[PDB]
Amino acid sequence: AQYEDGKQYTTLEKPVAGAPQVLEFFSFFCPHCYQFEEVLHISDNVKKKLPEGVKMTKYHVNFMGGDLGKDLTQAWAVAMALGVEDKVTVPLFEGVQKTQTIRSASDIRDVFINAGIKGEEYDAAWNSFVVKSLVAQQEKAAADVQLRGVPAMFVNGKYQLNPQGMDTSNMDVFVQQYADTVKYLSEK
Numbered sequence: 001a002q003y004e005d006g007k008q009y010t011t012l013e014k015p016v017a018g019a020p021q022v023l024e025f026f027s028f029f030c031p032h033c034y035q036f037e038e039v040l041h042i043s044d045n046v047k048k049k050l051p052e053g054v055k056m057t058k059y060h061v062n063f064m065g066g067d068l069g070k071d072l073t074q075a076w077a078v079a080m081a082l083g084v085e086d087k088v089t090v091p092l093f094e095g096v097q098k099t100q101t102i103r104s105a106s107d108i109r110d111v112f113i114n115a116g117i118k119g120e121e122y123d124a125a126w127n128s129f130v131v132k133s134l135v136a137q138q139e140k141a142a143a144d145v146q147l148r149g150v151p152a153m154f155v156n157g158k159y160q161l162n163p164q165g166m167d168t169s170n171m172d173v174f175v176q177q178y179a180d181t182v183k184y185l186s187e188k
């Protein structure tokens with residue numbers, strides 16, 4: 001077959017019930033996740049190949065960057081609660097990996113302030129139990145799939161993307177192969 005288990009994707013030994021349709025995991029310390037966001041724009045191209053009525057979910061992970069890694073998972077919960085993911089994703093990536101100006105929770109907060117989120121607005125969200133719940137959801141989703149590496153994408157709680165089995169000759173070709181695989185698994 002053109003799409004084969006173990007080539008473009010793998011099948012989870014224990015599928016996860018009630019999982020988001022398309023679940024994406026990343027870390028702001030993750031180098032390929034940087035490429036996935038700024039160079040390849042994976043999630044955008046995936047969204048454009050899925051049907052218009054399908055939910056896409058992106059979660060941060062703790063297992064990279066120690067203390068700051070957990071701060072960034074809580075900050076991503078704040079971004080999701082305020083709906084400002086598209087304003088802070090790039091400055092958080094570059095603050096961690098390019099300029100290396102993000103070294104504390106205060107530095108993370110500065111990114112939101114510079115992006116236009118008011119100080120009281122950010123601090124209220126940061127300390128809200130709604131964000132506490134959103135951090136728990138990010139943790140449970142990763143723990144449900146025994147996640148130990150990022151970037152990672154899971155389709156319908158049973159299929160995991162395998163970008164290693166795709167062509168990296170051409171970056172545009174890799175993205176389309178990736179997005180077509182998600183669409184194929186979505187229709188499975």
Ligand SMILES: Cc1cc(Oc2ccc(CC(=O)N3CCN(C)C(=O)C3)cc2)ccc1C#N
Nearest residue numbers: 032035039040148149150151163164168171174
């Ligand atoms: C064209 C291209 C293609 C790429 O392909 C990947 C993608 C993801 C991975 C997986 C990975 O990095 N992980 C997750 C699993 N584990 C256990 C880890 O430790 C680390 C590898 C190559 C990466 C970057 C670029 C670029 N520009």
